[PDB]
Enzyme design. Structure first.
Site, PDB file in Angstrom:
ATOM      1  N   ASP B  42       0.835  -1.188   0.000  1.00 21.73           N
ATOM      2  CA  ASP B  42       0.000   0.000   0.000  1.00 21.73           C
ATOM      3  C   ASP B  42       0.881   1.253   0.000  1.00 21.73           C
ATOM      4  OD1 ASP B  42      -1.831   2.126   0.449  1.00 21.73           O
ATOM      5  OD2 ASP B  42      -3.309   0.617   1.068  1.00 21.73           O
ATOM      6  N   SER B  92      -7.087   4.169  -1.648  1.00 25.06           N
ATOM      7  CA  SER B  92      -6.949   2.720  -1.571  1.00 25.06           C
ATOM      8  C   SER B  92      -8.203   1.941  -1.898  1.00 25.06           C
ATOM      9  CB  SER B  92      -6.468   2.293  -0.197  1.00 25.06           C
ATOM     10  OG  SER B  92      -5.273   2.975   0.116  1.00 25.06           O
ATOM     11  N   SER B 155      -8.009  -1.752   1.418  1.00 20.08           N
ATOM     12  CA  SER B 155      -7.395  -2.728   0.504  1.00 20.08           C
ATOM     13  C   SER B 155      -7.935  -4.156   0.671  1.00 20.08           C
ATOM     14  CB  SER B 155      -5.866  -2.680   0.615  1.00 20.08           C
ATOM     15  OG  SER B 155      -5.392  -1.331   0.613  1.00 20.08           O
ATOM     16  N   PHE B 269      -5.350  -9.274  15.337  1.00 18.44           N
ATOM     17  CA  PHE B 269      -4.234  -9.167  16.270  1.00 18.44           C
ATOM     18  C   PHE B 269      -4.094  -7.833  16.978  1.00 18.44           C
ATOM     19  CE2 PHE B 269      -2.992 -13.357  15.435  1.00 18.44           C
ATOM     20  CZ  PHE B 269      -3.146 -13.579  14.050  1.00 18.44           C
ATOM     21  N   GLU B 270      -4.835  -6.834  16.522  1.00 24.06           N
ATOM     22  CA  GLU B 270      -4.898  -5.562  17.226  1.00 24.06           C
ATOM     23  C   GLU B 270      -6.320  -5.061  17.130  1.00 24.06           C
ATOM     24  OE1 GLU B 270      -2.507  -3.566  19.007  1.00 24.06           O
ATOM     25  OE2 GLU B 270      -1.406  -5.456  18.933  1.00 24.06           O
ATOM     26  N   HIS B 320       2.425   8.637   4.997  1.00 21.00           N
ATOM     27  CA  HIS B 320       1.478   9.672   5.423  1.00 21.00           C
ATOM     28  C   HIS B 320       2.019  10.516   6.578  1.00 21.00           C
ATOM     29  CE1 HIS B 320      -1.818   9.022   2.750  1.00 21.00           C
ATOM     30  NE2 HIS B 320      -1.947   7.751   3.085  1.00 21.00           N
TER      31      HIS B 320
HETATM   32 CA    CA Z   1      -1.515  -7.639  19.449  1.00 19.09          CA
HETATM   33 ZN    ZN Z   2      -4.225  -0.577   2.345  1.00 17.19          ZN
HETATM   34 ZN    ZN Z   3      -3.238   3.039  -0.442  1.00 23.49          ZN
HETATM   35 ZN    ZN Z   4      -2.939   6.233   2.107  1.00 20.23          ZN
END
Ligand code: CA
Ligand code: ZN
Ligand code: ZN
Ligand code: ZN
Ligand SMILES: *[C@@H]1O[C@H](CO)[C@@H](O[C@@H]2O[C@H](CO)[C@@H](O)[C@H](O)[C@H]2NC(C)=O)[C@H](O)[C@H]1NC(C)=O
Ligand SMILES: *[C@@H]1O[C@H](CO)[C@@H](O[C@@H]2O[C@H](CO)[C@@H](O)[C@H](O)[C@H]2NC(C)=O)[C@H](O)[C@H]1NC(C)=O
Ligand SMILES: *[C@@H]1O[C@H](CO)[C@@H](O[C@@H]2O[C@H](CO)[C@@H](O)[C@H](O)[C@H]2NC(C)=O)[C@H](O)[C@H]1NC(C)=O
Ligand SMILES: *[C@@H]1O[C@H](CO)[C@@H](O[C@@H]2O[C@H](CO)[C@@H](O)[C@H](O)[C@H]2NC(C)=O)[C@H](O)[C@H]1NC(C)=O
Ligand code: NPO
Ligand code: NPO
Ligand code: NPO
Ligand code: NPO
Ligand code: NPO
Ligand code: NPO
Ligand code: CA
Ligand code: NA
Ligand code: NA
Ligand code: ZN
Ligand code: ZN
Ligand code: ZN
Lengths: 481, 481
Positions: B42, B92, B155, B269-270, B320
């Site tokens: 990405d 995205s 995505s 996982f988060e 970013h």
């Molecule tokens: Ca974690």
């Molecule tokens: Zn993405």
């Molecule tokens: Zn992107």
């Molecule tokens: Zn972006």
């Protein structure tokens, strides 16, 4: 603006089905290239290509990004790694060594292995690396160098010269010690190193002795001859070759290119670099496309084929000024020259590569709407509540503070041919960038241009396709009709 | 530093001869792909790839630019045109529609044709475009979505969702009117639209009702469940499938991936996005490479093959923040995941594509010496007599004025994982960029990835290679052993 036809998924599915069909029809040639052309967009990195595509698309009354450049039509693409041996972000001289001689070099040298050292004349000998163009000539092909810069500039000089210092345009530039050691200025090398059938571009002044009025600017002394050795290199070049002609304007170029008795043509159209296309006097000066055609008129006469170098040399210069308008208009003319050469040659027997020597810290961002001018403002204000442009540079002479703050920008301002896009870091000249550049290829053996390659691959695939040294045992059939 | 071996032209000539030999050995497959993998970096544009290559090269005690990334080894490269239908510089969501569904869309929508409109629920129906992943599932293949972002992020959501608003992660995000009109939040779509065999990444919080303590951060309420509809989407998903397991940490992921009775695996996982690799707790959280392997363990069991989406999702996030250190370290882990997948699958039957959804206004300039740190200072001062970095952004949160001037920068500062490179224009977040990105391909039908293509080509070539709708009449032989 949202083009209505693109709202229908069938539009995209049909296009992709067509693209798949075209991809499946591609077949490798079993035959050699008769002709070789390298189109070199100086500084024309991936961001330059996309931005130029959008501008050209809109030039033809389209929205922009959906319209292919001529280069976009080439079937085979690779990424080219441009680093010089000594610097990650390269110059034009040592990249020229890579894509024209097949060997990487050190920053600011030309036609020399990296055993040489910049500005050290006594490290030259033994380190000369011979260009594909030179090898093409040795094999009896005609050869041409066409560029919008001085013909002694780093990129074209890579086709013929070997020098530890790209800045040595004439003898006036070469220090006494280097002159004594026999490091010849590039203008001398142009006429002395090898026979070149067509030489077109800028760089008149380096060919004539100091005091020689420029024929086009006879009242501007700074444009006159530079040479301190009393030599007239044009006369010397003409004297070596029956059927040789020298021209300095477009009208004589035209006459020469159609003249059957002209076997060798040198056209030097400005004292230094040619004017930007947007500034070109179309009565006095040929465009890059016109010079390309003139070169092809003569080169195509040889039944053994030709090697042609064509440079969009001032793309680079536009970016250095951080004037994207100049960079991108130069890129479009470069693409026009590619297109024109494609009309005058056959991909059955001509291997054409389009590439860049390196990129620039040029970016295309913000979130502009479809169809908006590439020179326009990004929608929405920056954090400082002032406008900003979709085109920006990492560094360069567009960095400004007016009264202690980043200046606001208007559409009328941002769209001017003299506008310098803002940068993060003030420099007199914006820098090259080190990211990979594209290689586009079409013709015999073009399918070999693939993947991610060292920039040297460009020279090697060209020599291979034409069965030139070191690939005389290429095991290819004769070029196709 | 100049590496001595590179001073000899034989070094470059041998490498190029080897490259030509390799290029000549490439042959197209007559056989279909059994498996399909798309690796999506990405924000991983061409400047990101080169910079990451240099960093990775140096990570392995080399000079940098000469060492191939795993992606660099892929034989076939194309350029991908990333514009959305409505914006030249895309997001995205709508790029995901292109490379996963084969149709271009409007900025910030996902899995919808450009007849839909952002944040207008009532323009959804009829405009759903089905992903290649969905079609792979319909053809009896197993399917997996693996990412370092929320699994509901734009995505991965492109593989399964159709929504006019990428921001609709859970029901809490969807306006009342859109809920009434049946626009489902992305978390619901994840479990409802299609059967997905492996789902690994972030985004726990959107699956659970408000008040549900996060199992990993039970003392941080902001990390808890977001849902207002009382649904436990994880329980719902588990209830639909015998052999389904849910995990939230690395240890359970490992156990699940080796468990023959596990047919369906969801690992979240988060609460939101996964931590940057440089911040990852390696006891609690799997890396992208580890998640990729876990997905392959399960997906590879299906004799009919699999489709796998693997995203280096936080490359984008690093850029970013204008923290190139984060962007490039994410890119290296992404490349490590590519490398790992290559070890666990065969290019005889697996078509792998590596690409980016779009780029960033990230540039690599100055004229740094060979072997210098990518995070270092450009040699030589700027026009304001202060240092500057080789990595810069066109815009973003690294723009600074201290006491009315651009700040000086030291090597220790520029090399910090928290350092924000300077930009021309202050923005809270640096922007995407609109220039073409690379597509790298290997495996059955990978030779079809060539030239300059619309981003939609990525979805189409994948469907074609596996003889999926609309290419069931692919006329390919069965996948090779
Ligand atoms: Ca974690
Ligand atoms: Zn993405
Ligand atoms: Zn992107
Ligand atoms: Zn972006
Ligand atoms: C190229 O010429 C330079 C200049 O004469 C040589 O540099 C000198 O080398 C000697 C011996 O190493 C030093 O003591 C001098 O201080 C250097 N002079 C200068 C002015 O730099 C160099 O050795 C020559 N290189 C080759 C390949 O012959
Ligand atoms: C293009 O160059 C030619 C060749 O130098 C110029 O032709 C000369 O023109 C001058 C002035 O009219 C005459 O005195 C000579 O007879 C011409 N020389 C030759 C050899 O033909 C021509 O003027 C140039 N064109 C322009 C527009 O400047
Ligand atoms: C989607 O819903 C919106 C919101 O109700 C509709 O927009 C309205 O359209 C009418 C008639 O054109 C206008 O008079 C209103 O001012 C609009 N309302 C708002 C709040 O924007 C829209 O027509 C709907 N679209 C579809 C495809 O049914
Ligand atoms: C990984 O997740 C598992 C599953 O939720 C955790 O296992 C639980 O651990 C708690 C506290 O020790 C026990 O009360 C339970 O018996 C376990 N549940 C199950 C179903 O096994 C495990 O603790 C997690 N690992 C880490 C490091 O947090
Ligand atoms: O050849 N070049 O592009 C150069 C030359 C000198 C310099 O300081 C920087 C770049
Ligand atoms: O001596 N010079 O360099 C000159 C003399 C005359 C002229 O028209 C131009 C240049
Ligand atoms: O000299 N040439 O071959 C030319 C000159 C001008 C032109 O418009 C086309 C070709
Ligand atoms: O989806 N995006 O990357 C965005 C979203 C909103 C915005 O204002 C700019 C970019
Ligand atoms: O009510 N809540 O959102 C809670 C309650 C308890 C806890 O440990 C975490 C979150
Ligand atoms: O869960 N997995 O398949 C794993 C987990 C950890 C690891 O190091 C490799 C693979
Ligand atoms: Ca002129
Ligand atoms: Na000098
Ligand atoms: Na919203
Ligand atoms: Zn250059
Ligand atoms: Zn040049
Ligand atoms: Zn330059």
């Amino acid at each position: 603006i949202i083009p209505v036809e693109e709202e229908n998924p069938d539009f995209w599915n049909r296009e992709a089905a067509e693209a798949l069909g075209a991809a499946k029809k591609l077949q490798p040639a079993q035959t050699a290239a008769k002709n070789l052309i390298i189109f070199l967009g100086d500084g024309m990195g991936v961001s330059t290509v996309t931005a130029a595509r959008i501008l050209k698309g809109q030039k033809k009354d389209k929205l922009g990004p959906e319209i292919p450049l001529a280069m976009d039509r080439f079937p085979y693409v690779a990424l080219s790694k441009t680093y010089n041996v000594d610097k990650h972000v390269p110059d034009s001289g040592a990249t020229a060594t890579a894509y024209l001689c097949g060997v990487k070099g050190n920053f600011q040298t030309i036609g020399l292995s990296a055993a040489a050292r910049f500005n050290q004349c006594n490290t030259t000998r033994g380190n000369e690396v011979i260009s594909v163009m030179n090898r093409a000539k040795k094999a009896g092909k005609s050869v041409g160098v066409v560029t919008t810069t001085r013909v002694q500039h780093a990129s074209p000089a890579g086709t013929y010269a070997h020098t530890v210092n790209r800045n040595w345009y004439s003898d006036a530039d070469v220090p006494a010690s280097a002159r004594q050691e026999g490091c010849q200025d590039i203008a001398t090398q142009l006429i002395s190193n090898m026979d070149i059938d067509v030489i077109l571009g800028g760089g008149r002044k380096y060919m004539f002795r100091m005091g020689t009025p420029d024929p086009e600017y006879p009242d501007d002394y700074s444009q006159g001859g530079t040479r301190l050795d009393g030599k007239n290199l044009v006369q010397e070049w003409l004297a070596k070759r029956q059927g040789a002609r020298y021209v300095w304007n477009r009208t004589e170029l035209m006459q020469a290119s159609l003249d059957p008795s002209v076997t060798h043509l040198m056209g030097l159209f400005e004292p230094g670099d040619m004017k930007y296309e947007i500034h070109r006097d179309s009565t006095l000066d040929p465009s890059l496309m016109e010079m390309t055609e003139a070169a092809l008129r003569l080169l195509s006469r040889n039944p053994r084929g030709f090697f042609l170098f064509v440079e969009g040399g001032r793309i680079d210069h536009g970016h250095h000024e951080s004037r994207a308008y100049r960079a991108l208009t130069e890129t479009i003319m470069f693409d026009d020259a590619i297109e024109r050469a494609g009309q005058l040659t056959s991909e059955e027997d001509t291997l054409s590569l389009v590439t860049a020597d390196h990129s620039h810290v040029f970016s295309f961002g913000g979130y502009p709407l479809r169809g908006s001018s590439i020179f326009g403002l990004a929608p929405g204000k920056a954090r400082d509540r002032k406008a900003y442009t979709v085109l920006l540079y990492g560094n360069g002479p567009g960095y400004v503070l007016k009264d202690g703050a980043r200046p606001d920008v208007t559409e009328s301002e941002s769209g001017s041919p003299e506008y310098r896009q803002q940068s993060a870091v003030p420099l007199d000249e914006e820098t090259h960038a080190g990211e990979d550049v594209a290689v586009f290829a079409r013709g015999p053996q073009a399918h070999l241009v693939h993947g991610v390659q060292e920039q040297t691959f460009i020279a090697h695939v060209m020599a291979f396709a034409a069965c030139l040294e070191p690939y005389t045992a290429c095991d290819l059939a004769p070029p196709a009709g």
